[PDB]
Amino acid sequence: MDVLYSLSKTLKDARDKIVEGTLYSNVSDLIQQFNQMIITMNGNEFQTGGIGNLPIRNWNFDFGLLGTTLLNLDANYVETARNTIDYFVDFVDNVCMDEMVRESQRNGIAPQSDSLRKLSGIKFKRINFDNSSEYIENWNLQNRRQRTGFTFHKPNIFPYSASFTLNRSQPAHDNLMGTMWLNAGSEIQVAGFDYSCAINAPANIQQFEHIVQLRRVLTTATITLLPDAERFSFPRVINSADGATTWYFNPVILRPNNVEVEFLLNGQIINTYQARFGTIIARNFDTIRLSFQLMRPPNMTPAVAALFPNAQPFEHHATVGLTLRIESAVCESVLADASKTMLANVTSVRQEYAIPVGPVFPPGMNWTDLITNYSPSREDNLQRVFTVASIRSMLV
């Protein structure tokens, strides 16, 4: 991995720094590293495999070194370097794709493709130089059992889930009490509905709880909390739990009462926010507990009092909401996020070569299935393929 990354980084530096007219002293160390890579790779035969529709490709390395002959680089030097760099970049991209399309149940973090297994030999270790990118840095630290994290903007931590719970229900679905929620990506939009508007509640208070267990621990998370859930504030015709029939939802939005967001780690109260909205910070957590109350307004204007009668039928259903958005976080494990392209890159490579479903990942690299059952083996394989994808992104 470090050798493959070092090849990619050397090639990127060569493409960016070996430019016409540049001082010889701008590239001396780069030329030395590039010649070291050429020497190490010369005389070695590589094969990128024929898994799926990925074509089998054979790579031979017999390239002359780069000289150091002009004070300012000229077009001839750049052209020779470009020829060598193009061949090497093609080889590295093919190696990255081959590694990306494989997986293993037992040693998911270890190399899978023959080319990357060969590049893990001692003879190629000389190619290894600066490992500065976030993913390679995390890879190297993780190999040493050191604490490190990936920073995600809008981490895709919640598997898609749009469902409801009815705590009070009837066959006619006309006096319902329960909760709706959408947990999608970095967003949790929850709502608690009472059709009776807590007319018969002990203190005209109906308590609602939503507990979301994160599949991985998130640290240093910045979170936006908003009182209302816009997704559950318009009339809906909703299938029953079995799908036998459909019931009617006609929300009227009330201010959430006694709102408490608890971010829990190991069952301990790490962070607590009571009636606080806007931007909040969750230090380090793996569970979110949103508890909110629907309180019947003690004093109502005649129209509001007309909305909520003392008994059935109930045509306007009182709803309290909550929206939680993880704008950024840090996770010890790799995750899909809104800014990076690693999941997109791996999925595109797997789809474009018709890679058969393996024993580790879900079909089509479906992210909801992947995060739903985010096992340690899947974590290892995903980290491997994401690191390879980030290596490939430096050139392709």
Partner 1 sequence: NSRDAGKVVDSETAAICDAIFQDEETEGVVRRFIAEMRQRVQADRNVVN
Among Zn ion, partner 1, none, the one that 69 touches (CB under a kind-dependent 5 to 8 A) is partner 1
What is the C-alpha separation between 104 and 112, in angstroms, rounded?
Answer: 7
Question: At its nearest, how many Å lie between partner 1 and the CB of residue 25?
Answer: 7
Question: At its nearest, how many Å lie between Zn ion and the CB of residue 283?
Answer: 22
How many positions of this chain bind Zn ion (CB under 5 A)? 1
Question: At its nearest, how many Å lie between partner 1 and the CB of residue 328?
Answer: 45
Residues from 297 through 336 that contact partner 1 (CB under 8 A): none
Nearer to partner 1, 22 or 140 (CB): 22
Structure tokens at 341: 């392209």
Cite the DSSP H helix spans in 170-327.
302-307
Task: Write the DSSP string, 270-299.
Answer: EEEEES--EEEEEEEEEEEEEEEEEE--SS
Residues from 34 through 73 that contact partner 1 (CB under 8 A): 67-69, 71
Residues from 236 through 255 that contact Zn ion (CB under 5 A): 240
Among partner 1, Zn ion, none, the one that 67 touches (CB under a kind-dependent 5 to 8 A) is partner 1
Is 210 annotated in a binding site? The answer is no
Nearer to Zn ion, 343 or 395 (CB): 343
The alpha-carbon radius of gyration of the chain (Å, integer) is 28
What is the C-alpha separation between 267 and 189, in angstroms, rounded?
Answer: 23
> Under the criterion CB under 5 A, does residue 131 sit at the interface with Zn ion?
no
How many positions of this chain bind partner 1 (CB under 8 A)? 8
Q: Are strands 317-331 and 251-253 parallel, antiparallel or unpaired?
A: parallel
The length of the chain in residues reads 396
> Under the criterion CB under 8 A, does residue 75 sit at the interface with partner 1?
no
What is the C-alpha separation between 72 and 200, in angstroms, rounded?
Answer: 86
Among Zn ion, partner 1, none, the one that 71 touches (CB under a kind-dependent 5 to 8 A) is partner 1
What is the C-alpha separation between 352 and 335, in angstroms, rounded?
Answer: 22
What is the C-alpha separation between 153 and 340, in angstroms, rounded?
Answer: 9
Among Zn ion, partner 1, none, the one that 240 touches (CB under a kind-dependent 5 to 8 A) is Zn ion
Q: Which residues contact partner 1 (rule: CB under 8 A)?
A: 23-25, 28, 67-69, 71
